[PDB]
Amino acid sequence: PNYYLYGTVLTRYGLASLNHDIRRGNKTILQKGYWNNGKIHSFVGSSAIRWALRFYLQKQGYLVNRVWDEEEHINRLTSEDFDPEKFYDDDIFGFAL
RNA sequence: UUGCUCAAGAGAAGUCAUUUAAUAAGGCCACUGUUAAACGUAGGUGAGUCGUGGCUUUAUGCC
């Protein structure tokens, strides 16, 4: 049967400066917009969280097609052809060429 | 003085009276703009009115 895992996770309190918007001028301003009650809330992109999850998968030793160098800051592909059967990355996050 | 010399085709008259291009018609039925992504890191400003009034020590600032 089809099974789904939905979840809302709440992070710990602290100072935050993540996923900044365009660094126009000298300021590095946050990614902010409207939320409930019509007040301004700061946002963090979901692509960053997906990248963090993929990096966790890579660091834990699971076989992933995309590998982060952590030194040259370049993403390298283990195999040009995407194989979701073998790679955790392709199975979970999908792919598109 | 020219086969010439002169020489009005002239006077008057409504193309009129009447007539629906009318009756009827669905541009209709179907369509995902699908799939993937770290913001990394450095780019600026245009425009009035004129002589103390409630607080506060003139002071000097609030409305």
Automatic annotation (TrEMBL):
Name under which the protein is recorded: CRISPR-associated protein
Species: Nostoc sp. 'Peltigera membranacea cyanobiont' 210A
